[PDB]
């Protein structure tokens, strides 16, 4: 139905969301600390000096384990 | 059709693997710290010692910015 369209549609979206914003085809698994921005997948984020969001200094690169992942 | 409710529950376990596992009511938006574990919201995650996960302890809690977040502005309309 047109019902099952939508549904389709945010979890399109969400799935979307999810990946790198830098490579755009690996999931995100990293966060630039001490900022907290987690948009990267481990391989684009370990080669930022600054945040590609907010342009904050990047101290370290912490991996992060999501329950979506 | 039953499509849709198939895919109405696939939203809802997406959905629910966003909210905090302590609470069940809050996003997920903190990471203990040096586990990486990113399973709770910020209220849950500064009254746990050690990580509801692995069980290492908890030496801080890095707040962390997600493309997926949501908040009562996002209403539409
Ligand atoms: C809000 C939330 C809790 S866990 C999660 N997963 C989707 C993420 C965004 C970064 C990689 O997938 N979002
Ligand atoms: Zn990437
Ligand atoms: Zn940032
Ligand atoms: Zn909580
Ligand atoms: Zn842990």
Redesign the interface.
Same mark, same amino acid.
């Given at each position: 139905?047109q019902?099952?369209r939508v549904?389709?549609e945010?979890?399109r979206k969400?799935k979307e969301?999810?990946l790198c914003?830098v490579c755009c085809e690996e999931e995100?698994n990293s966060?630039f600390?001490?900022?907290?921005? /987690?948009?990267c997948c481990e391989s684009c984020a370990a080669q930022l000096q600054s945040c590609p969001?907010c342009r904050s200094r990047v101290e370290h690169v912490?991996?992060?384990?999501?329950? /979506?992942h």
């Open positions: 139905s019902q099952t549904l389709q945010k979890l969400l969301a999810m914003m995100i966060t600390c001490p900022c907290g921005h /987690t948009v969001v912490q991996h992060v384990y999501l329950p /979506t």
